Design a protein around this ligand. Structure first.
Ligand SMILES: [Mn+2]
Ligand SMILES: [Mn+2]
Lengths: 747, 746
C-alpha cells in the first residue's frame, strides 16, 4: 500500500478523515455504533484489560532503574489519539499526542520518514510541553509492514539547563534520534551537553525506550492472539468509548447550567530580589484566569477563558496543549477517576483559550519553564464550579473547595556535602493542604494538584541528597482556609545550610495573592511569605548553648526566631519569588507549603473542632474567637476546651457585628465605581485589567456594563506608567514557514 | 579496504599514524622530503594555484545567496588538517578542523557513519568555536568509495538567540542530511533557534552550495591530474606551510625571549550590569601575560602562564578559539600569504594553562562575546614581534598594536518596518590601528579580526536600523600619543527613530586600555559611555533650539549635556551594560577606539602636531602638555607651529621629566609597601590571587621581583568578593565517553 497506515492512507489522509467524521457526527471517527464492544463484549473488555495491564507493567518494570515522578507511558492509535495510559501523572498524554499530530501534519512520513524500529525524541516548546526538561520518546508500532499506532514515554529530567524571561534561554522537535532500535551517536554526544549531570539523562532515555519497546511487543502479542481485525476496531472504539463515559458521568453527578469563577496569582517582579536582566520585565503583574463553565443537557460542557490576562515577561506562561493536556490530572481526581481515561474525554470537552493570553500566547519569545505557578492557580477555580453542581445535586461527598497553590518550590544550586554538583531537591511541595469538603475538613499536607498521591519524603533521605539539615518540620498553623470545615493546612520545614559550597537558593510561590478561594462561606487559604537568615552566627550560638531556632515559624506576626539571631541578616517579607541568592553554612531557609481553601461559614463550625485545632496546631488561638466565634479556656492538662455559653454569645455578637460593619452591595458598588473612574488602584491591578480588555472584548463589555462606566472612560495600558513591551508588537508562530501547528482549542 | 580512508585505514588509525610521525620527526606526517614539490614543481604549483582559485570561486559565488565577511570555506585532508582557505576571515579554520578531528576521535565512522553525500553541521562550544552563532557545515569528499578530505563552510548568523549571561544552543557534529538532502526534523528544529527565519535558511543554503562546489572542484582536479598526485599534495602542502613559517621567522625576526602583557576590565559590579547571579556581581580584570620565545631553528613558543581565571561572564575563550583565531593577526604582519594553512599551527607551540579564561576547562563557562578578551590579549603580540622587526631593521613591519574592537553597538526590538530587528550597524569594523616606527597609524581603518575595514554608508545603515545619524566624526585624542601618533577612532551620534519595544547596550573596554604604546608611545584612549533618555528633542527641534550634533569632541568639556536640560544623561566610564530601554529621540554615542602610538611624543615633528589639531585628531590643549609644541591660530583660523616657543617647551619638559620622575628603586620600595599592606582595589587583588593559583611560575616571579616574604600571602577568599568557581569546578572530564583533542600544552 502507498501510505504507511493500515489500509493505505498516509498518516495525514488517515487523520483528516477521522477528524472530518468527528466534526460531522459529534462522535469520534463517526462511530455511531461500537460494533466490537456491542457484538463482542468479552473480547472488548479483555482488550482493555490486557493492554492496560501491559502498559502498567511496562511503566513499573522500566521504572526499576533508580539510585515516581512524571514518568508515564501512553498507547496511541495511528491518528495520534490516546487509548490507554499507564500509572503516573497523565499531564503528558496530550503533549506527546500533539508531537505525533505534529509529525502527521508536517509530512514526517516523507521526510525524515516513519519506519519500524525508529526512535523519535521531542520536547518542543511550540508543539506544547509542560516543562522544557520533560523529554518525550515516541516509537511507531507496525504490523505486517503497516503502521497501527504509536507509543509515548516521558520523564522529568532533573539536571538539565537564572531569572529567565524570554524563551531563548533547549528544544527538540520530533527528532529522529535512532533507527533499527539503535540510537545515533551524534545524538548521544549532543544531548549530554544539554545537561549538567550525565547519569540522570542517560538512564532516563534507557527507561523510556525500554517501556516503549515493551509496549510495542505488548501490542504485537495482543494483535497476534486476538487478531488485527479486532484490535483495529478497538483502536478507535476505545476513544469514542471514553467520550461516552465522560458524558455519562456529567449527566449523573453534575447539573446543567452556567458556572462563572475566576482565579488570580501574583508575579512581583518589581522587587529588587528579582534580578531579571531585562528592565522592561521588572514590573508587578497579576495573573487573570476567569472561566465560564457551561454544562449542557446532552452531557457536553465548555470551558471558556474569555477575559484572561496577557502573557508576560516571565516563566509562568503556558501552552494551549500544556493547559488542556494537564487539566485532566485535576479532573480525574473528582469527575472521572477512571483507569480508562484517554483522549475520548478530550473529544467530550470544549476549550476556548483566547489567542494571546498567558495560556495561549502564540508568541515565540514566551517562556514557560515554571508553568505550574499559573496553572495550579487557574485550575483551582474549576473545583469550585463543579462543586456547585455536586452540592445542588446532593453528592456532597464529592464537593471540594479547591487545590492549594503547589508552592514554595525549594530550589538550590551548588556543591553538596559530597563535593559534587547538586541535582536532587527535596520536593516537599508534593504535600500541600487540600480544599475543604461539604462534609469534613480538608486533608493537611496531603497532596498536590498534579499528584493526589502526595508523599512528603523522609527527612533522612533528603539530607543524603541536599547539603541541608532539618531544624524543624511542623504543621503550618492557620494556613488552612477557615470555614465550617477547615481547609487542609500546609506544613513547613526549617533548613540550615550544612556542608554546602558555592551554594545558592531562591523562593518560588504565591505571595501577595491566595490563588484558591473558599466555597459557599469558606475563606481562602493563607498566602505565602519568605523567611531566610544569613550571617546567623549559629555555629557560635550552638556551641555556647544559646537559643537556637527550631521547629516551624508558628506565628510570623510574632516570630520567635528573629530575636535569637541578633547579628543575622534576616529577610522576612511577602516576596515569595526570588532569583538565585548566595547562601552559606549555618544560614536558614524556611520552606513553607501552602494550605487549602475552606468551606462554609466559619461560625457554623462545631466548637470542639476549633478547640481540637488549637491543641493540634492547626489554628492559632488568636483566631478562635475572631474567625469562628469560639471561646476556649486552657485547662489543667494544658488542652483547650470549649466554653459553651461564652461561644453562643460570641457567635450571636459576631452576627450583629457583621450586620453593623457591613454595607448594602449597592452602596459599596458606587464607592468602588468612583475609584474605577478615578483610576485609583495599583499599577498591577490596572495593567491586569488593561491587558485583559484588549484580549477579551466580551470581558471589557461586561466590566463596563456592570460598573455603568461611560465610553469616555478608557483604561489604556500604555498610560499606566509601567513597561508595556510586547503588548502591541508580537512574534507570531505564523511567521515560521513550513510549520503547521494543530489547533486543539477555540481562540 | 574496510576503513573508509584511502588505503583501508580508519579515520582514527589514519590520523593516529600521521600524528605519531609528526611527534617523532618534528615534521608534519614525517615528511622529511616533499617528493611532489621537488620532482614535479609545476604540477605542485598548479594544484595549489588551482585549488586556491576554485575555493575562492566557491566562496564568492555562494556569497550571492543573500544581501557579512566572516563567511569562509576551507579544504581539509582526511585527517582534518587545513590545506587551503577561501577569502574571508580565517578564525574558523581551526574550529572546523577541530570538529573534523572530533568525529575522527569519537568514532563517527561507525556511528552515525560518514558516507558520501552526507551533510554535517556543527557549532559546539566544547569542541571550541568563536561565537555560538557561527555555524559550520562539513561535507566529506570521496574518491572511488574512499574518503580523501573534508570541506568546511562557516557563516556568522545574525539572528540567533540567548541577556546578561553568566554561564553556559549546541550542535555537535550532527548529521543533518544524507544523499545531499537535509532532514526535515533538522530544518524544523533549526527554525526555533532563530528570531527571523530568512538569515538562517539562506546561510545554510550558502554553506552547502559552497561545500558542494569545492567537492566538485576536488573531484574535477583529481580526475584531470590524478589521485596519486593529489594524495601526495594533501599532506606535503601542510608540511610546506610549516617550512614557510619557519623561513619567515628566520628572515624577519630575532631569536630570544619577548615578554609582554595585556589587560581589560570586566566592570560587573555596576548596577547597569543587570546580571541574574549575585555571585557574578563583581569587578574583575583580565590578565593576559605572554612569554614569547623564538628559537634558532625557527620554531617559536607562545606561553600564557600567569593568565587570570575564567569568570562569570561571556568573555571567556576556548583553547581552539584562541589558537584558531590568533592567525587573523599573524596573517597581518608575519605570514600574510594566501598559502596559509595548518602548517603554521604545526610550526607554533601554544601553552594555555588549564583553568585560565583561554582554556577554562569547565562546562559552566560562557563564550558568547569572547572578542572582548581575545582582542585585548592579542594586541600585546604585535609589540613583541615589533621588537624583532625593529632590531633587525624592518621598521616598515613595526606596529604598536591593534585597538580594542570596542563599542559594539547592539540593539533589539522592532524597526521602522514594524518587523523584528536583526541587522546592526557594524562600525567597530573600522577602528584606529597602531602607529608604526615610520609613520602614524591609520584612523578608523580596520579591526583586528578584519584588516579590510569598511565603515558602511550611513544611508544604508538607516535602511536597516531604526536609528538616524546626528553625527559621524573623527574621535579627537583617541589615538595613542607618540613620535608617530596611533590611529584615531571615530564616533557617530545616533537618535532613535521609528523604533518600538527598543533596547540597546554598550560593549567594550572602559577603565582599561588593552593596547600599549611602543618604545615611548602611549596607549590609545580608553572607553566611556554617553546616552540620553527623555531628551525632549522633538520640541527642541521644532522650536529651533540647540540640538546635539556631530561628535563628543571633548567629554571633559562637553557641549551636548547643557542642551538637554530635561534629559536623563548617562555619562560615565561604564562601557559594558545590559539591555536598556530606549525610545524615539533618545541618544546613543557609538565611540570607536583608536590605536596605540609609537615613540616619544617629544620627538614628533611639530608640523604634524599642528596638522593633527587642524584635522581634529588631537585636542589643542594636549599639543603642549604632551608633544611640547606651541601653536598659534593663524589668519585663516588654522594652527601653525611656533618653532622657538616649541624648542623651549621641549627643553623645559625634559627638565620637568627629570624633576618629577624618581629612580625606579625608590619607586619600587614604595610600591612594595603597598603590596605588603595589600593596598589596592579588589579587582586588582582578585586578578593576582587568581593568577597565582593558576600560574605558580608567575607567582614565583612576582614574589621575587618584589622581594616578598613567604609569610605574605594573597588568598582570593580574604579579598572580600564572591569566589564562586575558584575552588569547585565542573571539569569536562566528567562527561562520559567523550574524547577531546589537545592542541595545546596545559
Ligand atoms: Mn515535568
Ligand atoms: Mn561570528
Amino acid at each position: 500500500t502507498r501510505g504507511i497506515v493500515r489500509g493505505g492512507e498516509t498518516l495525514k489522509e488517515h487523520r483528516d478523515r477521522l477528524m472530518a467524521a468527528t466534526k460531522a457526527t459529534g462522535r469520534y471517527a463517526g462511530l455511531k455504533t461500537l460494533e466490537l464492544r456491542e457484538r463482542e463484549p468479552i473480547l472488548y473488555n479483555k482488550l482493555f484489560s490486557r493492554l492496560r495491564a501491559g502498559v502498567v507493567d511496562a511503566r513499573e518494570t522500566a521504572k526499576k532503574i533508580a539510585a515516581e515522578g512524571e514518568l508515564c507511558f501512553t498507547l496511541y492509535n495511528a491518528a495520534g489519539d490516546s487509548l490507554l495510559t499507564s500509572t503516573g501523572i497523565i499531564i503528558h498524554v496530550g503533549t506527546m499526542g500533539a508531537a505525533i499530530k505534529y509529525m502527521i501534519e508536517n509530512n514526517w512520513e516523507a521526510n525524515p520518514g516513519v519506519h519500524d524500529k525508529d526512535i523519535f525524541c521531542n520536547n518542543d516548546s511550540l508543539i506544547g510541553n509542560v516543562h522544557p526538561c520533560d523529554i518525550h520518546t515516541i516509537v511507531p508500532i507496525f504490523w505486517e509492514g503497516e503502521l497501527i499506532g504509536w507509543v509515548g514515554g516521558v520523564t522529568h529530567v532533573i539536571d538539565t539547563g537564572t531569572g529567565q524571561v524570554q524563551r531563548f534561554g533547549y528544544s527538540i522537535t520530533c527528532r529522529k534520534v535512532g533507527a533499527n532500535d539503535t540510537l545515533f551517536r551524534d545524538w548521544l554526544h549532543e544531548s549530554q551537553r544539554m545537561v549538567r549531570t550525565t547519569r540522570y539523562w542517560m538512564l532516563d532515555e534507557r527507561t523510556r525506550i525500554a517501556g516503549c519497546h515493551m509496549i510495542r511487543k505488548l501490542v504485537e502479542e495482543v494483535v497476534a492472539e486476538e487478531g488485527i481485525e479486532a484490535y483495529w476496531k478497538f483502536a478507535y472504539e476505545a476513544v469514542e468509548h471514553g467520550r461516552l463515559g465522560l458524558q455519562a458521568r456529567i449527566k449523573a453527578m453534575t447539573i446543567p447550567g452556567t458556572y462563572r469563577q475566576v482565579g488570580f496569582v501574583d508575579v512581583p517582579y518589581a522587587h529588587e530580589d528579582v534580578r531579571v536582566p531585562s528592565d522592561f520585565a521588572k514590573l508587578d503583574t497579576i495573573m487573570h484566569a476567569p472561566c465560564e463553565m457551561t454544562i449542557r443537557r446532552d452531557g457536553t460542557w465548555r470551558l471558556d477563558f474569555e477575559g484572561s490576562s496577557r502573557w508576560g515577561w516571565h516563566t509562568y506562561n503556558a501552552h494551549q496543549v500544556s493547559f488542556t493536556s494537564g487539566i485532566w490530572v485535576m479532573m480525574t481526581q473528582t469527575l472521572i477517576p477512571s483507569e480508562m481515561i484517554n483522549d475520548g474525554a478530550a473529544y467530550g470537552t470544549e476549550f476556548r483559550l483566547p489567542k494571546g493570553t498567558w495560556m495561549n500566547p502564540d508568541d515565540r519569545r514566551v517562556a514557560f519553564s515554571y508553568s505550574w505557578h499559573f496553572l495550579v492557580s487557574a485550575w483551582t477555580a474549576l473545583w469550585r464550579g463543579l462543586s456547585r453542581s455536586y452540592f445542588g445535586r446532593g453528592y456532597l461527598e464529592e464537593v471540594n473547595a479547591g487545590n492549594a497553590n503547589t508552592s514554595n518550590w525549594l530550589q538550590g544550586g551548588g556543591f553538596n556535602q559530597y563535593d559534587e554538583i547538586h541535582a536532587v531537591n527535596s520536593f516537599e511541595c508534593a504535600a500541600n493542604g487540600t480544599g475543604a469538603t461539604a462534609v469534613q475538613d480538608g486533608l493537611s499536607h496531603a497532596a498536590a494538584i498534579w499528584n493526589p498521591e502526595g508523599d512528603m519524603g523522609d527527612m533522612e533521605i533528603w539530607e543524603l541528597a541536599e547539603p541541608l539539615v532539618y531544624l524543624g518540620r511542623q504543621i503550618k498553623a492557620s494556613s488552612g482556609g477557615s470555614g465550617k470545615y477547615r481547609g487542609g493546612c500546609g506544613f513547613e520545614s526549617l533548613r540550615m545550610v550544612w556542608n554546602a559550597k558555592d551554594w545558592t537558593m531562591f523562593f518560588m510561590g504565591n505571595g501577595h495573592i491566595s490563588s484558591d478561594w473558599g466555597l459557599m462561606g469558606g475563606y481562602p487559604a493563607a498566602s505565602g511569605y519568605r523567611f531566610a537568615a544569613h550571617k546567623t552566627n549559629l555555629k557560635e550560638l550552638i556551641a555556647s548553648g544559646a537559643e537556637i531556632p527550631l521547629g516551624g515559624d508558628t506565628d510570623p506576626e510574632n516570630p520567635t526566631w528573629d530575636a535569637m539571631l541578633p547579628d543575622a541578616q534576616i529577610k522576612r517579607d511577602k516576596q515569595a519569588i526570588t532569583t538565585e541568592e548566595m547562601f552559606s553554612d549555618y544560614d536558614l531557609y524556611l520552606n513553607y507549603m501552602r494550605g487549602g481553601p475552606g468551606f462554609g461559614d466559619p461560625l457554623d463550625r462545631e466548637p470542639q473542632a476549633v478547640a481540637d485545632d488549637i491543641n493540634g496546631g492547626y489554628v492559632l488561638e488568636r483566631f478562635a474567637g475572631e474567625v469562628y466565634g469560639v471561646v476556649v479556656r486552657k485547662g489543667a492538662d494544658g488542652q483547650y476546651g470549649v466554653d459553651e455559653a461564652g461561644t453562643a454569645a460570641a457567635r450571636a455578637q459576631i452576627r450583629k457585628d457583621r450586620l453593623a460593619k457591613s454595607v448594602p452591595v449597592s452602596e459599596w458598588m458606587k464607592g468602588e465605581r468612583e475609584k474605577i473612574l478615578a483610576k485609583d488602584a495599583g499599577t498591577q491591578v490596572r495593567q491586569m485589567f488593561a491587558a485583559s480588555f484588549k484580549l477579551g472584548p466580551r470581558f471589557e463589555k461586561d466590566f463596563r456594563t456592570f460598573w455603568s462606566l461611560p465610553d469616555s472612560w478608557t483604561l489604556p495600558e500604555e498610560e499606566i506608567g509601567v513597561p508595556t513591551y510586547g503588548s502591541r508588537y508580537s512574534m507570531d508562530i505564523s511567521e515560521l514557514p513550513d510549520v503547521h501547528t494543530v489547533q486543539f482549542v477555540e481562540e
